[PDB]
Chains A and B, each alone.
Chain A
Amino acid sequence: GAMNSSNYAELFNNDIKLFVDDTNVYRVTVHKTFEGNVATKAINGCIFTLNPKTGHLFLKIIHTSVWAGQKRLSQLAKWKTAEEVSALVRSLPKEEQPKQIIVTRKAMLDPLEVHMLDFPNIAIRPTELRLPFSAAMSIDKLSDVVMKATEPQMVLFNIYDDWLDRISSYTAFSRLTLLLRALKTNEESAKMILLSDPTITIKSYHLWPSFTDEQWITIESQMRDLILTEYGRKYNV
């Protein structure tokens, strides 16, 4: 059934599963026309498909050409997402295919179920968690590859960098969701925290800075403060 706080540890067991977030698939800027009407301009988007146990992120870039001449784009985006996730699964060897796919938005359920009819044993599940995966386009290296794409493209990253050498996938997922929650609540501050110190760099093959274990504790603390701070400034508490 639905994934929530009670069954959170299931994310890190040895049954292959993927989260799918479609928030950033169909992206637009809204603008005024010469006649004073409003119109949209699509920009490149992405499907965020993540193995929470391994950190494997299959980042399928959605190029604006896929929308050309199409109607009802917000509806189409869900079906395109489902089509691409299904194609990804079919591309994986049998022993790498997920046993569950958890969608972050319930409107993905029927589109993904229909595209996955060929896989009756893969469970398609919603979640009651409010996961911050929309903030993926606040990770500079991910946003850069999406905006630079000139055609449809899949790009592969471990979203945990090398953290699993030192911590468990529960702890890694908790760090990731804390970072993304912070970037989603106050992107400027969050990035200030992450890069405030010139001496700590991001390896060419990584997404996040190379913090020591102790620096991660300090960082994680600064992110939780931010999420509480902003929550006050928002609610006046």
Chain B
Amino acid sequence: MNTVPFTSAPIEVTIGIDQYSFNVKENQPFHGIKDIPIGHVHVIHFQHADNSSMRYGYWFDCRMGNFYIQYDPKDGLYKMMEERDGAKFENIVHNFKERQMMVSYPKIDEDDTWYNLTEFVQMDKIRKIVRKDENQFSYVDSSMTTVQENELSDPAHSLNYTVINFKSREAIRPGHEMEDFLDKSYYLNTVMLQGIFKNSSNYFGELQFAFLNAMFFGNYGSSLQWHAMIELICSSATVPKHMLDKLDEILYYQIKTLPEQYSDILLNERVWNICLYSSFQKNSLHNTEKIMENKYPELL
């Protein structure tokens, strides 16, 4: 069980760790989060009390280094940093734990929610979407635009999701225009799965990461990417059975976790109605269709 200590908390902030969140008052004696489960990526995220504009945070994996948070009063945010001195770090944490100045990652034993949301998400792939190679952790915020958004403006601060465009030469074989547009299997299976992602695990990892950035940061380009990756599968007549079954599980837990009061903005009516009721896979997403109908029947 790993720890992310905080030097201090000088400004009032709501802190998220994965799907949990807690309030810290200005100058409250808070020194971090302990008992973080090893084996998953995690995200620690921030919304200041005085300017709820800009949610921001850091994707990290405690297996890749010792990370801590320190507020920077010049740039005005909580920054993640890596501590290279292992003995300094262990001693800092041990002191903070001894004074009980840390919150405990509060994982109920029965609960597989975070695993189910990050099953295919891997730090190494996050770091190719979010390019900042000098750090082992990845910063994301509400305003960062995606490469595709930038084609339609600072390249260094972009989300490099895989571009998916259904009316593009990449998606449409010369001479198969109608076929490829109405049945996207060749774009899914040959261009994207075999060609770009190499396997469905990497495809699902990007889809899950896009959803989590949409949900935790209100990142609009991430929401677009999540829906595009769903629609590409649902609009393909030929999908491996194991991918459809896994997709249904992936989406079930995403819809389960989504805050009820954010569904209006985080869920695209056209995509979901098309996917659940018109598409080739309208009959292949039983768990997802059941939770959607019982939890968001208005959207449909």
Residues in A lying within 8 Å of B, measured CB to CB: 76, 79, 82-83, 110-111, 113-115, 117-118
Contact = CB atoms under 8 A, between A and B. Distances in A.
B178 A117 contact: no
Contacts of B178: 76, 79, 111, 114
22 contacts: A76-B178, A79-B177, A79-B178, A82-B177, A83-B177, A110-B167, A110-B181, A111-B177, A111-B178, A111-B181, A113-B167, A114-B167, A114-B172, A114-B177, A114-B178, A114-B181, A115-B177, A117-B167, A117-B168, A117-B169, A117-B172, A118-B169
Interface in B125-171: 167-169
A111 B178 CA distance: 7
A13 B125 CA distance: 52
Interface string B168-210: 1100100001100100000000000000000000000000000
Contact count band on B: under 10
A118 B169 CA distance: 8
Given A79-B178, A110-B167, A113-B167, 17 more contacts: A76-B178, A79-B177, A82-B177, A83-B177, A110-B181, A111-B177, A111-B178, A111-B181, A114-B172, A114-B177, A114-B178, A114-B181, A117-B167, A117-B168, A117-B169, A117-B172, A118-B169
Nearest to A113: B167
Contacts of B167: 110, 113-114, 117
A82 B182 CA distance: 14
A53 B168 CA distance: 31
A194 B172 CA distance: 48
A111 B177 CA distance: 8
A79 B167 CA distance: 14
A101 B168 CA distance: 19
A113 B165 CA distance: 13
B9 to A, nearest CB: 52
B169 to A, nearest CB: 5
A118 B177 CA distance: 12
A76 B177 CA distance: 11
A83 B167 CA distance: 15
